Amino acid sequence: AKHLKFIARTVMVQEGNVESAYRTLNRILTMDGLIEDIKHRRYYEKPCRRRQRESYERCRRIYNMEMARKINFLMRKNRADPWQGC
Amino acid sequence: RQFSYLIENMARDCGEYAHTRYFRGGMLTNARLLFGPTVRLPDLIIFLHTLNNIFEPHVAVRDAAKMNIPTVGI
Amino acid sequence: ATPSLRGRLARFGNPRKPVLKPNKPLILANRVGERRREKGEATCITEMSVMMACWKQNEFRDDACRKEIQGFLDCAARAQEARKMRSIQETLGESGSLLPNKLNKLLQRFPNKPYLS
Amino acid sequence: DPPPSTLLKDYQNVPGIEKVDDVVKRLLSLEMANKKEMLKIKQEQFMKKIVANPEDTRSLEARIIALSVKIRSYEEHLEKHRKDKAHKRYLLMSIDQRKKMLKNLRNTNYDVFEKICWGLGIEYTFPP
Amino acid sequence: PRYELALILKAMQRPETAATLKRTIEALMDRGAIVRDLENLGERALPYRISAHSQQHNRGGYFLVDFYAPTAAVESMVEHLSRDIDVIRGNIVKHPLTQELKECEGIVPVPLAEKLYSTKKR
Amino acid sequence: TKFSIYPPIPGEESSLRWAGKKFEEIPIAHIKASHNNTQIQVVSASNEPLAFASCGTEGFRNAKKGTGIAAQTAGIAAAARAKQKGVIHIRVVVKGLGPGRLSAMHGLIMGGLEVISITDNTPIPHXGCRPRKARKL
Amino acid sequence: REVLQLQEEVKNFITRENLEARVEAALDSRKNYNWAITREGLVVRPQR
Amino acid sequence: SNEDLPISMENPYKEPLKKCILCGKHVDYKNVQLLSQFVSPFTGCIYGRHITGLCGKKQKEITKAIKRAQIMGFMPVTYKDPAYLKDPKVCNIRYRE
Amino acid sequence: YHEDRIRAKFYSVYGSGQRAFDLFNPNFKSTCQRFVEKYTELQKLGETDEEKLFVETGKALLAEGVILRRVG
RNA sequence: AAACUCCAGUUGACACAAAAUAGACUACGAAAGUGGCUUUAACAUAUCUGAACACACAAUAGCUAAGACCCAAACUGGGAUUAGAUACCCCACUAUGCUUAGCCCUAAACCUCAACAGUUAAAUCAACAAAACUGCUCGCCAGAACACUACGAGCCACAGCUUAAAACUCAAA
Ligand code: FES
Ligand SMILES: [K+]
Ligand SMILES: [K+]
Ligand SMILES: [K+]
Ligand SMILES: [Mg+2]
Ligand SMILES: [Mg+2]
Ligand SMILES: [Mg+2]
Ligand SMILES: [Mg+2]
Ligand SMILES: [Mg+2]
Numbered sequence A: 001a002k003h004l005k006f007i008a009r010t011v012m013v014q015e016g017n018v019e020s021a022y023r024t025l026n027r028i029l030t031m032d033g034l035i036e037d038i039k040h041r042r043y044y045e046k047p048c049r050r051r052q053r054e055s056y057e058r059c060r061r062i063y064n065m066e067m068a069r070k071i072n073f074l075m076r077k078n079r080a081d082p083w084q085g086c
Numbered sequence B: 001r002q003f004s005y006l007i008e009n010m011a012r013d014c015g016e017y018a019h020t021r022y023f024r025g026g027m028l029t030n031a032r033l034l035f036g037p038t039v040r041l042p043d044l045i046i047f048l049h050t051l052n053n054i055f056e057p058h059v060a061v062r063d064a065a066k067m068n069i070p071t072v073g074i
Numbered sequence C: 001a002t003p004s005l006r007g008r009l010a011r012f013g014n015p016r017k018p019v020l021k022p023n024k025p026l027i028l029a030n031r032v033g034e035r036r037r038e039k040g041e042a043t044c045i046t047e048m049s050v051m052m053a054c055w056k057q058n059e060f061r062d063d064a065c066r067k068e069i070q071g072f073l074d075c076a077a078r079a080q081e082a083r084k085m086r087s088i089q090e091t092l093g094e095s096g097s098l099l100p101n102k103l104n105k106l107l108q109r110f111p112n113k114p115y116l117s
Numbered sequence D: 001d002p003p004p005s006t007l008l009k010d011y012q013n014v015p016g017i018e019k020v021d022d023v024v025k026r027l028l029s030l031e032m033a034n035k036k037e038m039l040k041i042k043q044e045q046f047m048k049k050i051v052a053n054p055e056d057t058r059s060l061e062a063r064i065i066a067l068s069v070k071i072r073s074y075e076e077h078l079e080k081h082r083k084d085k086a087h088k089r090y091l092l093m094s095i096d097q098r099k100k101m102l103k104n105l106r107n108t109n110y111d112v113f114e115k116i117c118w119g120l121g122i123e124y125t126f127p128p
Numbered sequence E: 001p002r003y004e005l006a007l008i009l010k011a012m013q014r015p016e017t018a019a020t021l022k023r024t025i026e027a028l029m030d031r032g033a034i035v036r037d038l039e040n041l042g043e044r045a046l047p048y049r050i051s052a053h054s055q056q057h058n059r060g061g062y063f064l065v066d067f068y069a070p071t072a073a074v075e076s077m078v079e080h081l082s083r084d085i086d087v088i089r090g091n092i093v094k095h096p097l098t099q100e101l102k103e104c105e106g107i108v109p110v111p112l113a114e115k116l117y118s119t120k121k122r
Numbered sequence F: 001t002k003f004s005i006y007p008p009i010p011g012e013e014s015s016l017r018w019a020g021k022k023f024e025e026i027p028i029a030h031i032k033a034s035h036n037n038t039q040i041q042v043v044s045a046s047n048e049p050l051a052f053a054s055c056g057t058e059g060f061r062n063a064k065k066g067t068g069i070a071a072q073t074a075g076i077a078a079a080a081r082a083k084q085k086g087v088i089h090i091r092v093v094v095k096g097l098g099p100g101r102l103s104a105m106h107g108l109i110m111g112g113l114e115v116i117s118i119t120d121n122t123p124i125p126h127x128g129c130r131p132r133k134a135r136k137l
Numbered sequence G: 001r002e003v004l005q006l007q008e009e010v011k012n013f014i015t016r017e018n019l020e021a022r023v024e025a026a027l028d029s030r031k032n033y034n035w036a037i038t039r040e041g042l043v044v045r046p047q048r
Numbered sequence H: 001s002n003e004d005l006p007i008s009m010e011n012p013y014k015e016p017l018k019k020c021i022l023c024g025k026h027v028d029y030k031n032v033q034l035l036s037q038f039v040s041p042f043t044g045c046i047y048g049r050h051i052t053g054l055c056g057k058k059q060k061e062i063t064k065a066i067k068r069a070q071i072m073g074f075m076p077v078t079y080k081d082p083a084y085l086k087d088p089k090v091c092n093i094r095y096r097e
Numbered sequence I: 001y002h003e004d005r006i007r008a009k010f011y012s013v014y015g016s017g018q019r020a021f022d023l024f025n026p027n028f029k030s031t032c033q034r035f036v037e038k039y040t041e042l043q044k045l046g047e048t049d050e051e052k053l054f055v056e057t058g059k060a061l062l063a064e065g066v067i068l069r070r071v072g
Numbered sequence J: 001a002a003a004c005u006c007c008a009g010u011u012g013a014c015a016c017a018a019a020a021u022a023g024a025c026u027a028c029g030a031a032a033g034u035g036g037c038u039u040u041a042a043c044a045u046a047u048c049u050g051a052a053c054a055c056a057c058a059a060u061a062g063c064u065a066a067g068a069c070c071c072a073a074a075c076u077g078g079g080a081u082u083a084g085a086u087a088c089c090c091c092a093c094u095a096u097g098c099u100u101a102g103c104c105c106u107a108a109a110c111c112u113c114a115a116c117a118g119u120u121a122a123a124u125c126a127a128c129a130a131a132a133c134u135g136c137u138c139g140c141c142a143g144a145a146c147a148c149u150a151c152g153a154g155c156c157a158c159a160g161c162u163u164a165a166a167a168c169u170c171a172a173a
C-alpha cells in the first residue's frame, strides 16, 4: 500500500502471448510459495494443525528426496542385461 | 552371473558339479522329495560367491550347515 | 541436499523435543507410487462459448454461425484424438521419466536393507 | 556502586592510563559500559577485601562472592521488573545455592566463613 | 557502549539539513554521548512511502552517526528523535563493528542419520 | 535488444512504447477474482474509471457467477465499454485465486484489448486478521 | 595497543568546536556501503 | 620391525572444507545491494538456504539484516529494488521455463 | 604412508600428470612416483627443509626432461 | 435462502489486532512456552540425587475491576437441511481471545520414555513402539469396576481445585 506499484509480481507480455506470461506469473507465485500460502489462509489453521502439517511436509520432503537420490543412483543399472542366458 | 559360464565349465572339467542358477527352496533340506529317497547329497560345497543377487547370503550357506555339509567359500 | 535427520526424532539420548513426528518409519520402500491419473476438466469451452454466442444473436440459425460452429466441431475432434494420443504415450512412457512398473523392477534388484544379514 | 569514572577492570593496570585525554578516560570507564562491567568491579573489590588470595577464583570463598554479586544484580533487576518470573526463579535458586556454599564453608573453614559473612553482610540462618 | 544512529531526514535544502544534523548531534552530546563520526549516505527514494509528523515522504537523506554513550542515553535519545519534525525515521543500533566475527573453517558436512530404527526384520 | 519480463521502472529512460504512450500511461484493468464472483474495472493511469463489468452485472446469478465462462463474459463486456473510450493496451492487475482469474483476462482480449503486462496483487497478510474457522465437511 | 589506537582516533572525533565544520564537510561527501557478491566469492564494488 | 608397514597419521589428501560465498565477509543491514541478491525479484521473499547456498551462520545473518533493513527504511519488502536486478545472480533458482 | 604427504602436495602443485596410469603394469611409475623417489633421495642427502626440498626436486626432473606444468 | 444495498470497485489517509517468506534452520528456556524491529536488563549451581510437610512457576479456558476493539467467535437469533437437527452448512452478533491490576492452578501439561554416571560384549530381544543394558538415587505402582466419586482437610478457589477411600458387584478387565 505504501510501496511502488507495477513492480511486485509483474510479468511483461511478449508478442501478445498472454498465456505464456500468465503461466510464468503462476510459476513465479508457485515457486515462492504464495499460491499454497493463499490457499492455506482461506480458513484459520489452528497451530496444532499447522505443526502437524509442517511435520508431515518435512518428512515427505526427506523421503521424496532420498527416494529420488536412490532412483538416480540406480538408473545406470537399467541398461540391457550383459549376461543374458546366465 | 558374470562367471556362471566359467564356473559351470570348471566343474565339468574337473568332474564335479556346479549350481550357478536360481536356487530353488529346498534343494538340500528337501532333496529326497525333489530328487528321490536314494539321492546322494554333496560332501563338500564350494562357494565362489557367498552372496545372492540381492546382496544377502546365499540360502545354501544356511542349508549346507543344516544338512551338515562342510562349505568352502570366498 | 536432503534435510538433516540428526536430532529430529524423539529418541533416547536426544535432549531436545522432537522436530518430526512421522506416522510411518522414515525408511525407503522397495516400490514407488503408481502414476496418478490427473483430474480431468471440461475442454473446448472457449470454442463452445463462441458458437453459443452467435446463436444468441442469430436466433439459433446454423446458417449464420457456420465458421464458429466448424471451429467448435474441430476443437472437440482434436480433444477427442488428443485423449487417444495421450493414453498411448502414457502407457508407453514416451514422455515419462520412467514407468512405476519399470522403476519398481529396478528397485527389486537393489532392495533397501533396514536389517542385518 | 563504584563511581562511573572508575576504569574498566581490563584497562586499570595499563601503563600510562592516567595521562591520556579525558575523553579516552570516559570511553574506558564504567559510564560508557554495560552493567556487567560494573559487576566485575564489585566482584574485584569484594575479593581483595575478604579473600586471602584475590587471584584464586575457584575457592569456596570466591564463588560465594561471585554468586553474591549475581544475587544483588537480580534483586536490582527485579526491583524494576516485578513480573519477570524467569529472573525471580534465578534469584531464589541463587540464594539457595549460596546457602549451600555457606553451609559447606562453615563446616570446613569457620574463620573464613566469618569473614565472608562480615564482608558481604550475610546473616547466616539455620533452616527450619 | 558504541552505537550507530541510522537517521533518515526529511528532504530539505542544504541549510535546513545542516541545522537538523547539528541539532541532532547536540542532543546526543547533551545526553553524555561522545560522537565519533558523521557519514552522509546520500539522498535517495525511500523503499516505501513513510508518514511522519502529519506528512507523507517519498525521498529522504540517509545519514549515520557513530558515537559512544551510556546505556541510559539510548532510551532518552529515541524519545528526542520522535519529536523532531525533520526526522522521518531514526533507529539506534549497536555498532556492527563492535561485534567481532568468529573465524569459520568451512562447511562441516552432515552424514545421513543412522540407527534411527532397530534392525529387526519388519 | 533482448526481452525483459521485468516492467520498465518509472523515471528511467526506456524505449518501450504502446501507441506512443509509456508504460506509466497505459490504463489498468483491475480484475478481482473472488471465489463466487469476478469483478473487472478498467481505469486510466490517472485513476479515472472507464468501464466496469462483473459476473453479476452480466446476468449471472448465484453459483453461475463463480465460473470461468461467467468471468469471460464480464471481460468482454468491460472491454467493449473501455474500447469505446479509447482503450487498446491495458495493464492487468488481478487479485484473487477465483475461477475467473484467467478467464476474465481472455474476455478482455476477445473484446479487442491488448494485454501488455500481468500483475498479481492478491492480498497476503504478513502475520493480519484471523480468518474464519475451518469447515467440517 | 588498544589505548594507543583509541588515543589517535579521539583526535578526529566531533566536538562542539568543529561541529559546524564537520556537518558542512559531511554534506559534501558521500559514503557507500553497497557491494555485491559473485558466485566465485568476489566483491563487486559499485561504479562510482 | 618392518619399514613397509602403514603409519598412523591424518589424511594427507583431505580436501579443505567448502565455504559459503560470504564466508569471512561482514553482512551489514546498510548493504542493501548484497541483501537484495537473496530475495525474490517478483515477491521480495527471502530465499531459503537451499537456494542461496549459504551456510547456517550466514543464512541467519542475511535474514536478520534483511528484516532490520526493511523496517529501518533501507530495503523494500514486497519486491527487489529494481536498481539491483542486474547484479550477479548467486542464487540457484530459475523462474522462466 | 610417509610418501602420501609428498603425493598430496605434488597433486596440488602440479595436478595429475597428463600421462595416463597403467594399473596393469605391476612396475608402473607415474610422474608423481618419479617425483617421490627423487624427493626421497634428496632427503637422504641431509636436506631437511620441506619447502626447499620440494623446489629442488622439480628442477632435477626438468633437467632430466620431465614436463611439470604447474596448475596455477 | 436469509443477510447488506450511506453497498461494491479504484485511489488516498489510517491500529491498545496479528506477526508471509527466512524455517529444507533445529536454536533458547526448568517446564509451560518462545520464530516482525530496536535498545536496556538478563539466562542459578567448579560433585551428584533430593521437599506431596515448603517456596516459586505453570498453555488454553475461566473469575474480578478498568480500558481497547480490526478480525475471529461459545452462547443466542435468523436461513437452509432433516422423520426430528437443541448439530454438521450459510449470515449476524455477544462473552471471550488483547492491555493493565489481581485471582484461578487445570491439559493426551505426552517426546505417556525420571535425574546423574556409564556400556555396546555377553543371553540381542514376549509383541508393538523410539535397539539392549549396568551403577546410583528419588518419585510412583500392586485385578476390574465403584472412582478425575463419597467423607475429612487445605485453598482469594463456592456448579472449583488438590489429596482420596469403602460397601455392594464381577471372573475377568
Ligand atoms: S562457510 Fe564460513 S561463514 Fe559460511
Ligand atoms: K516459516
Ligand atoms: K512477520
Ligand atoms: K504426546
Ligand atoms: Mg544417559
Ligand atoms: Mg502413529
Ligand atoms: Mg538438586
Ligand atoms: Mg495458568
Ligand atoms: Mg483472560
Ligand SMILES: [Mg+2]
Pocket (backbone or CB within 6 Å): none
Ligand atoms: Mg466479525
Ligand SMILES: [Mg+2]
Pocket (backbone or CB within 6 Å): none
Ligand atoms: Mg467483543
Ligand SMILES: [Mg+2]
Pocket (backbone or CB within 6 Å): none
Ligand atoms: Mg498485541
Ligand SMILES: [Mg+2]
Pocket (backbone or CB within 6 Å): none
Ligand atoms: Mg505441550
Ligand SMILES: [Mg+2]
Pocket (backbone or CB within 6 Å): J112
Ligand atoms: Mg506424565
Ligand SMILES: [Mg+2]
Pocket (backbone or CB within 6 Å): J114, J115, J138
Ligand atoms: Mg527427579
Ligand SMILES: [Mg+2]
Pocket (backbone or CB within 6 Å): J144
Ligand atoms: Mg482397582
Ligand SMILES: [Mg+2]
Pocket (backbone or CB within 6 Å): J148
Ligand atoms: Mg480433572
Ligand SMILES: [Mg+2]
Pocket (backbone or CB within 6 Å): none
Ligand atoms: Mg472432587
Ligand SMILES: [Mg+2]
Pocket (backbone or CB within 6 Å): none
Ligand atoms: Mg468435600
